[PDB]
PDB file of N, CA and C in Angstrom:
ATOM      1  N   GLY A   1     -10.368  -8.819 -26.741  1.00 53.13           N
ATOM      2  CA  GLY A   1      -9.778  -9.416 -27.972  1.00 53.13           C
ATOM      3  C   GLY A   1      -8.348  -9.881 -27.766  1.00 53.13           C
ATOM      4  N   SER A   2      -8.008 -11.021 -28.357  1.00 50.52           N
ATOM      5  CA  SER A   2      -6.663 -11.575 -28.236  1.00 50.52           C
ATOM      6  C   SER A   2      -6.126 -12.006 -29.598  1.00 50.52           C
ATOM      7  N   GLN A   3      -6.957 -12.705 -30.364  1.00 48.77           N
ATOM      8  CA  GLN A   3      -6.566 -13.171 -31.692  1.00 48.77           C
ATOM      9  C   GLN A   3      -7.049 -12.205 -32.773  1.00 48.77           C
ATOM     10  N   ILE A   4      -8.114 -11.459 -32.467  1.00 48.83           N
ATOM     11  CA  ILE A   4      -8.676 -10.489 -33.394  1.00 48.83           C
ATOM     12  C   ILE A   4      -8.731 -11.020 -34.833  1.00 48.83           C
ATOM     13  N   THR A   5      -8.960 -10.122 -35.788  1.00 51.36           N
ATOM     14  CA  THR A   5      -9.044 -10.501 -37.195  1.00 51.36           C
ATOM     15  C   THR A   5      -7.989  -9.773 -38.023  1.00 51.36           C
ATOM     16  N   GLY A   6      -7.373 -10.494 -38.953  1.00 52.22           N
ATOM     17  CA  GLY A   6      -6.351  -9.900 -39.795  1.00 52.22           C
ATOM     18  C   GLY A   6      -6.930  -9.060 -40.921  1.00 52.22           C
ATOM     19  N   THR A   7      -7.154  -9.689 -42.071  1.00 52.37           N
ATOM     20  CA  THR A   7      -7.692  -8.997 -43.238  1.00 52.37           C
ATOM     21  C   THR A   7      -9.211  -8.934 -43.194  1.00 52.37           C
ATOM     22  N   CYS A   8      -9.817 -10.082 -42.966  1.00 49.76           N
ATOM     23  CA  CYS A   8     -11.260 -10.199 -42.954  1.00 49.76           C
ATOM     24  C   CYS A   8     -11.880  -9.552 -41.714  1.00 49.76           C
ATOM     25  N   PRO A   9     -12.697  -8.487 -41.889  1.00 51.42           N
ATOM     26  CA  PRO A   9     -13.330  -7.802 -40.761  1.00 51.42           C
ATOM     27  C   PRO A   9     -14.451  -8.616 -40.123  1.00 51.42           C
ATOM     28  N   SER A  10     -15.092  -8.000 -39.144  1.00 50.84           N
ATOM     29  CA  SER A  10     -16.225  -8.595 -38.457  1.00 50.84           C
ATOM     30  C   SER A  10     -17.278  -9.028 -39.440  1.00 50.84           C
ATOM     31  N   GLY A  11     -17.556  -8.146 -40.376  1.00 53.74           N
ATOM     32  CA  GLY A  11     -18.552  -8.417 -41.387  1.00 53.74           C
ATOM     33  C   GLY A  11     -18.330  -9.764 -42.027  1.00 53.74           C
ATOM     34  N   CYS A  12     -17.067 -10.154 -42.174  1.00 52.49           N
ATOM     35  CA  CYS A  12     -16.751 -11.447 -42.752  1.00 52.49           C
ATOM     36  C   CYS A  12     -17.083 -12.555 -41.767  1.00 52.49           C
ATOM     37  N   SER A  13     -16.889 -12.302 -40.470  1.00 48.84           N
ATOM     38  CA  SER A  13     -17.186 -13.318 -39.473  1.00 48.84           C
ATOM     39  C   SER A  13     -18.675 -13.561 -39.470  1.00 48.84           C
ATOM     40  N   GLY A  14     -19.416 -12.473 -39.517  1.00 46.99           N
ATOM     41  CA  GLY A  14     -20.858 -12.586 -39.596  1.00 46.99           C
ATOM     42  C   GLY A  14     -21.346 -12.778 -41.019  1.00 46.99           C
ATOM     43  N   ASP A  15     -21.355 -11.703 -41.799  1.00 46.18           N
ATOM     44  CA  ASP A  15     -21.792 -11.800 -43.182  1.00 46.18           C
ATOM     45  C   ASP A  15     -20.647 -12.261 -44.059  1.00 46.18           C
ATOM     46  N   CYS A  16     -20.703 -13.513 -44.426  1.00 44.34           N
ATOM     47  CA  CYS A  16     -19.690 -14.102 -45.284  1.00 44.34           C
ATOM     48  C   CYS A  16     -19.885 -13.696 -46.739  1.00 44.34           C
ATOM     49  N   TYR A  17     -19.469 -12.487 -47.104  1.00 42.03           N
ATOM     50  CA  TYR A  17     -19.612 -12.060 -48.480  1.00 42.03           C
ATOM     51  C   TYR A  17     -18.602 -12.809 -49.341  1.00 42.03           C
ATOM     52  N   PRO A  18     -18.830 -12.860 -50.657  1.00 41.41           N
ATOM     53  CA  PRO A  18     -17.971 -13.604 -51.579  1.00 41.41           C
ATOM     54  C   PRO A  18     -16.491 -13.283 -51.493  1.00 41.41           C
ATOM     55  N   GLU A  19     -16.130 -12.023 -51.323  1.00 43.19           N
ATOM     56  CA  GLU A  19     -14.717 -11.684 -51.311  1.00 43.19           C
ATOM     57  C   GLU A  19     -14.025 -12.148 -50.038  1.00 43.19           C
ATOM     58  N   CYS A  20     -14.779 -12.638 -49.053  1.00 40.12           N
ATOM     59  CA  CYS A  20     -14.142 -13.145 -47.845  1.00 40.12           C
ATOM     60  C   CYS A  20     -13.355 -14.415 -48.211  1.00 40.12           C
ATOM     61  N   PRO A  21     -12.038 -14.473 -47.939  1.00 37.62           N
ATOM     62  CA  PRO A  21     -11.226 -15.656 -48.261  1.00 37.62           C
ATOM     63  C   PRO A  21     -11.639 -16.883 -47.442  1.00 37.62           C
ATOM     64  N   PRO A  22     -11.522 -18.089 -48.024  1.00 36.27           N
ATOM     65  CA  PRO A  22     -11.901 -19.340 -47.368  1.00 36.27           C
ATOM     66  C   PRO A  22     -11.595 -19.406 -45.874  1.00 36.27           C
ATOM     67  N   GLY A  23     -12.545 -19.970 -45.147  1.00 38.86           N
ATOM     68  CA  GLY A  23     -12.406 -20.147 -43.706  1.00 38.86           C
ATOM     69  C   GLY A  23     -12.259 -18.846 -42.937  1.00 38.86           C
ATOM     70  N   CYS A  24     -12.590 -17.728 -43.572  1.00 39.07           N
ATOM     71  CA  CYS A  24     -12.499 -16.444 -42.879  1.00 39.07           C
ATOM     72  C   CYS A  24     -13.749 -16.207 -42.046  1.00 39.07           C
ATOM     73  N   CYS A  25     -14.905 -16.575 -42.587  1.00 40.65           N
ATOM     74  CA  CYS A  25     -16.159 -16.391 -41.886  1.00 40.65           C
ATOM     75  C   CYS A  25     -16.465 -17.589 -41.008  1.00 40.65           C
ATOM     76  N   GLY A  26     -17.019 -17.322 -39.830  1.00 40.97           N
ATOM     77  CA  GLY A  26     -17.343 -18.395 -38.904  1.00 40.97           C
ATOM     78  C   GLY A  26     -16.200 -19.373 -38.714  1.00 40.97           C
ATOM     79  N   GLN A  27     -15.068 -18.851 -38.268  1.00 41.10           N
ATOM     80  CA  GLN A  27     -13.878 -19.662 -38.039  1.00 41.10           C
ATOM     81  C   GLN A  27     -13.347 -19.491 -36.617  1.00 41.10           C
ATOM     82  N   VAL A  28     -14.069 -18.730 -35.809  1.00 39.83           N
ATOM     83  CA  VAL A  28     -13.670 -18.487 -34.428  1.00 39.83           C
ATOM     84  C   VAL A  28     -14.837 -18.697 -33.474  1.00 39.83           C
ATOM     85  N   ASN A  29     -15.085 -19.956 -33.159  1.00 40.70           N
ATOM     86  CA  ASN A  29     -16.161 -20.327 -32.258  1.00 40.70           C
ATOM     87  C   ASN A  29     -15.881 -21.689 -31.628  1.00 40.70           C
ATOM     88  N   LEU A  30     -15.699 -21.715 -30.309  1.00 40.16           N
ATOM     89  CA  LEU A  30     -15.425 -22.965 -29.602  1.00 40.16           C
ATOM     90  C   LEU A  30     -16.693 -23.805 -29.437  1.00 40.16           C
ATOM     91  N   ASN A  31     -17.650 -23.629 -30.346  1.00 41.74           N
ATOM     92  CA  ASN A  31     -18.901 -24.375 -30.295  1.00 41.74           C
ATOM     93  C   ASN A  31     -18.828 -25.614 -31.184  1.00 41.74           C
TER      94      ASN A  31
END
């Protein structure tokens, strides 16, 4: 890990629940 996640946990990266702030989920992928 280098950039890691601030407020939004892994769950937000994967499961984008409503309380996840905009662009928090699926925002770290060089794809």
